[PDB]
């Protein structure tokens, strides 16, 4: 149904507010906020959101506390001031997906339309993208397990339309723009290996752990496609790609001729002014 979503940083800075207005009480649980957006178009666009007092139990996980009057009053006043945005779903700040999320999401599945779920981290130490759109749809399983709520990952992007780019750029004054060239390219080409190294290294350890020490079926069926796609590149002998290395290396030669020739053109004004300026300033100095 929905291919991609658009999440503005305003809601995540509202999660920064979720971490600001705590008051140093010692709970810092998965505070659930009421996510708002535009479900009209096929693409999802989050503009702003708000929160609702949400408290769980220490031992029992099935305890969840929501509010209908606060949702209808905040949504009623927010719709009165801005009727272009309506309820879409919710989101929790907890890093782990608990079992009670089917009951928490089920309320906004009954009263509200199909709600999207977003799992983020309480500490911004994760290098990866903090936002993951998880659609709440029921899928048929091939093994015969009963139909249950399934959270499929929907791709997400963090973009701002008109003003939030200007506000973020003014508040930071440290981040740089695209700036194609040497630095913005070589930084990605340096740290990209760590950007994949922390992800893959962080995933395959618990993966290999759950291979031998795993039960409660984790959908082993998708592991066959996992190792299949991993074995779709069986160390090609590079025999056919030699001519492609001749093509890319020939373009490299083109960059060599462009650099040497163009820089040789740049040497004109320098290697002329260095003489005509020094000898004339010297002969005319005294």
């Amino acid at each position: 149904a929905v291919q991609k979503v658009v999440v503005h940083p305003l809601v995540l800075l509202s999660v920064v507010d979720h971490f600001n207005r705590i008051g140093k009480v010692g709970n810092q649980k998965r505070v659930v906020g009421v996510l708002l957006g535009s479900w009209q178009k096929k693409v999802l666009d989050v503009s702003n959101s708000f929160a609702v007092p949400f408290d769980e139990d220490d031992k029992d996980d099935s305890v969840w506390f929501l509010d209908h009057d606060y949702l209808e009053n905040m949504y009623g006043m927010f719709k009165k001031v801005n009727a272009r945005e309506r309820i879409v779903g919710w989101y929790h700040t907890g890093p782990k997906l608990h079992k009670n999320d089917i009951a928490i999401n089920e309320l906004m599945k009954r009263y509200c339309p199909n709600s999207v779920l977003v799992i983020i981290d309480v500490k911004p130490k994760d290098l990866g993208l903090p936002t993951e759109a998880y659609i709440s749809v029921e899928e048929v399983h091939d093994d015969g397990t009963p139909t249950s709520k399934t959270f499929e990952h929907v791709t997400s992007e963090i973009g701002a339309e008109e003003a939030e780019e200007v506000g973020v750029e003014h508040l930071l004054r440290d981040i740089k723009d695209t700036t194609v060239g040497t630095l913005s390219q070589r930084i990605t080409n340096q740290v990209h290996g760590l950007k994949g190294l922390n992800s893959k290294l962080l995933d395959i350890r618990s993966y290999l752990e759950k291979v031998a020490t795993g039960k409660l079926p984790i959908n082993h069926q998708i592991i066959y496609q996992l190792q299949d796609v991993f074995n779709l590149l069986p160390d090609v002998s590079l025999q056919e790609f030699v001519k492609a290395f001749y093509l890319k290396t020939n373009d490299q030669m083109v960059v060599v001729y462009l650099a040497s020739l163009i820089r040789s053109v740049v040497a004109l004004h320098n290697l002329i002014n260095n003489k005509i300026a020094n000898r004339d300033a010297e002969k005319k100095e005294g």
Partner: protein, 53 residues
């Protein structure tokens, strides 16, 4: 004075040597600021505009 010029001059050796990485920092940072302000004054020029004579 004759032999003291060596060790006294070493302080000038260090004071002039310390400026190398400093001018490296200035020449590597002020051009980053040059492209920052350059793109900042470049992005002011927007396509929607009025045409005069």
């Amino acid at each position: 004075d004759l032999y003291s010029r060596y060790k006294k001059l070493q302080q000038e050796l260090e004071f002039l040597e310390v400026q190398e990485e400093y001018i490296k920092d200035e020449q590597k940072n002020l051009k980053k600021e040059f492209l920052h302000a350059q793109e900042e004054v470049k992005r002011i020029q927007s396509i929607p505009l009025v045409i005069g004579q």
